[PDB]
A paper describes a structure:
Gh-ChrR belongs to the superfamily of NAD(P)H-dependent FMN reductases that catalyze the metabolic detoxification of quinones and their derivatives to hydroquinones, using NAD(P)H as the electron donor. This family of enzymes protects cells against quinone-induced oxidative stress, cytotoxicity, and mutagenicity in both prokaryotic and eukaryotic organisms. As expected from the sequence homology between Gh-ChrR and other members of the FMN reductase family (Pfam ID: PF03358), Gh-ChrR functions as a NAD(P)H–dependent metal reductase.
The crystal structure of Gh-ChrR was elucidated to a resolution of 2.25 Å. The crystallographic asymmetric unit contains four monomers, each with a single bound FMN. The homotetramer is assembled as two sets of identical dimers (cyan/yellow and blue/purple) that are aligned side-by-side with an approximately 60 degree angle along the parallel plane α4 and α5 of each dimer. The β-strands are organized into one parallel β-sheet, β2:β1:β3:β4:β5, flanked by helices α1 and α5 on one face and the remaining helices on the opposite face. FMN binds in a pocket on the surface of Gh-ChrR near the dimer interface. The negatively charged ribityl phosphate group of FMN is deeply buried in a positively charged region (blue) composed of residues in the loop between β1 and α1 (S15–N22) and a positive electrostatic dipole from the N-terminus of the capped α-helix (α1) similar to that previously reported. As a consequence, the active site of Gh-ChrR is open and solvent accessible, a feature observed at the active site of oxidoreductases that facilitates promiscuous exchange of substrates. While bound FMN is observed in the crystal structure of Gh-ChrR, NADH, an essential electron transfer component of the reductive reactions catalyzed by NAD(P)H-dependent FMN reductases, is absent. Regardless of the forces holding a negatively charged Cl− ion in place in Gh-ChrR, the side chain of R101 is a good candidate to assist the binding of an anion. Negatively charged species analogous to Cl−, including chromate, ferricyanide and uranyl ions, may be recruited to the catalytic center about R101 at a favorable distance (∼3.5 Å) for hydride transfer from FMNH2 to the metal.
Author numbering:
A (entry chain A), B (entry chain A): 5 to 188
C (entry chain D), D (entry chain D): 6 to 187
């Protein structure tokens, strides 16, 4: 049983640490699980009910269908102002108005990375609150808060090289895989 | 002592109930307090550190200076997916990177309106969490959650006419005024 | 073939949440037996010192009834925009138990309140603790019983409101489907 | 000319948060007297039934020491991603007091933990209750003492760490400025 996971990325900057983390998920995945990245949340317009009425942005239905046809989603994001980046919450707001709504019943795992010690934990719980409304099924264990990320991805090379973080994340994908196969 | 309050609006749609609420604040204000609306959060680009480096969007510094020169801010917003609209969190993310940062030390009052019973309370507390980081001074009492807003603003005329809601909000501005004069 | 237990967050005899909790066995969908756990009020305040002189008997007892239950329904009021301390104290004791009763446990929440918001805030704080305990907490439908005052007979102390009974039976239906699935 | 009281969220003799709480009077900026409130452990579990037979004596006592204090420093661990039930129980009792001691009260929070996060999650849940109580809770600087194990002498039970003592003295400075301002 080959699973397909897609990753949703909360940062827009080229040198993003969270992006480096996301890029590593596919090389980290345990055999039997392919992982690809979704489109950029940066292509979405700001959510407006007027825009919705005129019609859903193509990039939003694209992301909706890729999530819906995926076996699980891994959300990978920094924490902004003790919460979720507004850009990322904005992508969530759009996906939440689609019918059928793509996150409903969808296995979901969260990963946050910060240069600081909290490792973006404040973000994960606000994001959970929204996901309750969307009826996603978010993995409780293990939680992935990557503090001091600056020390875990080597500079100029962009890559996540920290061995223990790769182990941790690889095991989180396994649990996500097990969660998905159990709601199947 | 004449105070000046500005209002930050969380919805983009023309027929927004929260917009109707905001529009009423100035006619509601107690003598000695002028209230004007800020620019639209819809003119901001998605927050990106790359964009920041190239330079702050003009609409962001505009809003920063209007807030900083204001005696207090009233934030008026719907709740999206049990949290703050991503568009509004995105405007918050931008303002948070300005120097000096405009919300630091700023008296702030929150107002949320929902057609439902919760009246957007889930949003107010997530928004508070962010505002702690920004060092804003957000009014505890009275809290303004306007549930069943559909019944409180008359249709086709756009206006907030519910007498008790106007009283409640007018008294919340007074408390905001008292909070501001006390940090002065 | 399905057994649910109820954990109650108010101690006062005339508690609105207690009324709600008593109706659950009555309105439950057939094939579902729902029984009440013991009172959270018999726990001492958590303390690691006390724990190291062995677990309070009722703590092991409740741990036992939860662990071998198919699901837990937590029915509680909201105190100060959050979970009642006494309820949270129960949850704290249970979280230290030998193997921890709530790991993997299907859970539904029900809050009741005289006010507008119906204990909504309490639920989300509770969800955050349940994450750490690896409980599987039902998303839909959420049960917030605001304006409880008019839905419970002031004498008799039974939730009269028919619509509310029907709603809770549906939440039970959903909680069952969550349990069988997991 | 400034008086702060401390409210402690752990009951265990060898509590890391207790160590932190004892250092506060020592490192306090001159002109600031800091004394400990009574133990939250002497409260019974909240109940409206108990309340209607009059408030537990220690509840009125603590209400009294808080109300006439210039500020409160709440020092507590994090239990299950939230506030310890026993601490929350104290807060629950205080919230019902005659006039409520925390309305308008300047407050700083300090959490300590062996782990990375240092009780961060606890603080934000607590802030949500304090909103309803109209406490004025200091934003900057926030004091999360992660990895507390290495900052407190295992024998002696005093927070040895110099940097941490210096940080807390600054938070006290800030809490004072908040108090004089309000
Ligand atoms: C607007 C803004 C808000 C931020 N808020 C937080 C925060 O609340 N907590 C935190 O640890 N870091 C915060 N940061 C710092 C980010 O954690 C850090 O910039 C991180 O590397 C961004 O992730 P990225 O590298 O994937 O872009 C914030 C940064 C910005 C620009
Ligand atoms: C994407 C989206 C998410 C929403 N989330 C919530 C919610 O969590 N709680 C709620 O009560 N209403 C929610 N609503 C409904 C809004 O409360 C309602 O549409 C409101 O009138 C919008 O405010 P406005 O009239 O100022 O635009 C949501 C609406 C949208 C479009
Ligand atoms: C200490 C305390 C705190 C309370 N906090 C809230 C609150 O934050 N929101 C609310 O709607 N009701 C609050 N209430 C009121 C309860 O919702 C109400 O008393 C309810 O009936 C208690 O549940 P019960 O009837 O099952 O005992 C509080 C009550 C007490 C005693
Ligand atoms: C019931 C319980 C729940 C706990 N939950 C957490 C938690 O969520 N996060 C954390 O970092 N530590 C948690 N801890 C560990 C405490 O942070 C640690 O025991 C700390 O030393 C307690 O504070 P104290 O030393 O002052 O008693 C928990 C401990 C207990 C007993
Ligand atoms: Cl930062
Ligand atoms: Cl809706």
């Amino acid at each position: 049983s080959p699973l397909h996971f897609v990753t949703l990325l909360g940062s827009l900057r080229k040198a993003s640490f969270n992006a480096a983390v996301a890029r590593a998920l596919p090389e980290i995945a345990p055999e039997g699980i392919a992982i690809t990245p979704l489109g950029s949340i940066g292509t979405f317009p700001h959510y407006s009910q007027d825009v919705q009425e005129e019609g859903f942005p193509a990039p939003v239905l694209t992301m909706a269908q890729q999530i819906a046809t995926a076996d699980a989603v891994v959300i990978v994001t920094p924490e902004y102002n003790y919460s979720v980046p507004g850009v990322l919450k904005n992508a969530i707001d759009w996906l939440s108005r689609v019918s059928p709504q793509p996150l409903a019943g969808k296995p979901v795992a969260l990963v946050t990375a910060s240069p600081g010690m909290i490792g973006g934990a404040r973000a994960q719980y606000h994001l959970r609150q929204s996901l309750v409304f969307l009826d996603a099924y978010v993995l409780n264990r293990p939680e992935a808060m990557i503090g001091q990320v600056t020390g875990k991805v080597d500079a100029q090379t962009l890559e996540l090289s920290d061995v223990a973080t790769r182990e941790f994340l690889a095991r989180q994908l396994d649990a996500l895989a097990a969660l998905a196969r159990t709601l199947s």
